[PDB]
Design a protein around this ligand. Structure first.
Ligand SMILES: Nc1ncnc2[nH]cnc12
Ligand SMILES: Nc1ncnc2[nH]cnc12
Ligand SMILES: Nc1ncnc2[nH]cnc12
Lengths: 289, 284, 285
């Protein structure tokens, strides 16, 4: 059957999503995960929760062992990963309190281990060139959107709905993220350049987590929590740590509701062909073979 | 009391701007700084000078230990840092021989240690998320512009003056820089792309120096020397002009130190320190 | 005094361009190269070939030791380097099966050793700031283009010819590449941003290879093989890539012959003089 890993960002250190069955420590060919993993059940759906930044939020986005976290969830038999990401908005219609079910990204990270395969010692032998045109699992994306509908959260889809139909607080049914390396926030100059490229939000944690998930043969979807307008607007709306966590409290209640419904909706369907296609995509991407 | 640190770039490998009182061979948690630090006074204002690339200019931009350079100045009690940066112009009105008091940047560096904090080698415990919307100390920026005026150098502010005020050589009162990693210069393709993004100049050394200065609680301002047009558009004349630009910048730096020491900075220093404290993600 | 090195990418992990005269297992001051280097002759012209990814194609683009590859070729006496690079098209008129003799690039790589000089122990002493406005050797570019003409391969020059004179498959007489770090391909978002910038193709291996070749005082030119459209827009592509490899081999063999047919004394002089004039450490400025 299925088993859903949850990767919690800011505000989701120990989200108490179910009734904790146990705590498990996993070892990985790529090092230790950010923390031990909490195993349990949402309904009768197996679920495991892993905080991205560890215990007391001591691991910055740039130094998170994304390889170990994803592989640990794969090792425990996860078929899916749902992840949360706090983010700043680059557009007027994405406002604090909204959420975004991302479908695209632009990568500006560096110095992070972004692949399981290579020639280095602590890498799997081989060369893996994975396609990433649409880098998320689309079925799992639509689960997150449907979970929002089931919880009476407004859903805004810019592909068919105009900006006059956008009703806050809402889940944006698509969106593109630029992932910066951190730990600093962007300059106004960088923020305007990203905006001019058409990007919707900026975060620090999406990449390479999303890429490694696909490399691992797992279905991955992310829901971003809009906490601020980055720094392209007026000075009082400029992002800081205080502003990011201030918006978060009312949002985490709704995000947790979305995540819990999504896990149940995943367990209500058959994923046999999707899981097989995920694994076959990894094999067809090996260019050493 | 104020104490002004100066980080000298290309053309300032061993400036000797004042009668030196002493020299400090220091070390920091993040390693050795680029060279010995030279101590003296401009009037009654204490001043410390270090060459970004070392006395021999043997250290390329991506291998400069920016963390050690900023922290060594912090350890000596510096309240300000003034820095020079040689650059290429991406825009028609910024010509070789001009200067730019930068107020913005777009970062394309990689592989450099750009934060004092983390879970990394030598890094301090914690997670620091500094706001960087306007990344310089604005008071110190205006002191640089004011020093240029008192040195009879034309000041051009495109936001507030007409085109006819752009008389060369001039100090541009604002501007944005793309910081590339080096050591190679840009291709024509890259230069065209950076120009289309609206950037004013290209350089190799501003980042992470400016970021670490804010992390250290110090007021930072940069004055860039336009040394040529980047390749979106004879070397004996360019070299002679750069020598004149170095003379102009030495005089701006010396005047700037005196202007800084004429004002009180208690509030700004405390505000710099408080911004660091409120940026600790692990503590909130 | 002329000797042509060849760096083969995808489709050239086991090149077999000429009869192997000698097989060199070399080391460099910057590590070992991707594989043994094979020496031989194309006609009377000495030649050296090296698979960028190794025979097993086990080395991904970001882990290739570009320093060692370029330096090993130079240590063996090479004056030129011809390189192949598989790529995706970002433009309508560059169709799979076409080739591109590149003249420009935009670099989005990171974490790769991109210079021979510096202050670390595994680098040469000094600070080298190389100009790169037109980063390839123009004479060698034109030899690749002329080689395509001599082998009856269409050449499309957008500066000279009409857009309807673009007959496929063809060698494009110019073009710009974005080099991404890999190993993953681009997202649709990134592909559209790159296309919006005006870039022609996307690849993973051009940089820092082209930059190190100029640092080494060598004439470098690249021929890119369009294998697909990038995602702005399995067997039929494999058969199309098989045909592309055959015609790229023909271009490479002909280009070596054309290089050996001319005098390069002044060009080589200028290559070496550019390295020396680009030193900015003060005791060797
Ligand atoms: N403005 C911002 N930039 C990057 N990451 C963020 N996380 C929350 N707000 C952010
Ligand atoms: N064109 C240029 N690009 C980058 N750094 C420079 N320093 C001086 N000129 C430069
Ligand atoms: N689309 C693509 N992107 C990067 N490298 C490639 N090599 C072949 N096709 C490619």
């Amino acid at each position: 059957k299925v088993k859903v890993g949850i990767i919690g960002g800011t505000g989701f250190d120990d989200p108490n999503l179910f009734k904790k069955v146990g705590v498990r420590q996993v070892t990985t060919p790529f090092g230790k995960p950010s923390d031990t993993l909490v195993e349990g059940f949402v309904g009768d759906v197996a679920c495991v929760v892993l905080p991205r930044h560890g215990k007391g939020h001591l691991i910055p986005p740039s130094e998170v062992n994304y390889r170990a976290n994803v592989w640990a969830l794969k090792d425990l038999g996860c078929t899916h990963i749902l992840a949360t990401n706090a983010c700043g908005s680059l557009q007027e219609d994405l406002v604090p309190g909204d959420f975004v079910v991302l479908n695209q990204f632009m990568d500006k990270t560096w110095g992070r281990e972004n692949t399981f395969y290579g020639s280095k010692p602590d890498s799997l032998k081989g060369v893996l060139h994975m396609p990433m045109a649409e880098p998320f699992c689309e079925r799992t994306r639509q689960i997150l959107i449907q979970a929002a509908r089931n919880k009476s959260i407004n859903v805004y889809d810019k592909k068919t709905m105009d900006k006059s139909a956008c009703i806050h607080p809402c889940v944006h049914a698509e969106g593109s993220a630029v992932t910066i390396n951190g730990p600093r926030f962007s300059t106004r100059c960088e923020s305007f350049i990203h905006k001019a490229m058409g990007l919707d939000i900026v975060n620090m944690t999406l990449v390479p987590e999303v890429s490694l998930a696909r490399e691992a043969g797992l279905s991955y979807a992310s829901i971003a929590i809009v906490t601020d307008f980055d720094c392209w607007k007026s000075e009082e709306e400029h992002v800081c740590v205080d502003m990011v966590l201030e918006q978060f409290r009312k949002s985490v209640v709704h995000v947790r509701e979305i995540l819990l419904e999504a896990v149940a909706l995943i367990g209500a369907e058959d994923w046999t062909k999707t899981i097989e296609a995920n694994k076959a995509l990894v094999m067809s991407s090996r260019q050493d073979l």
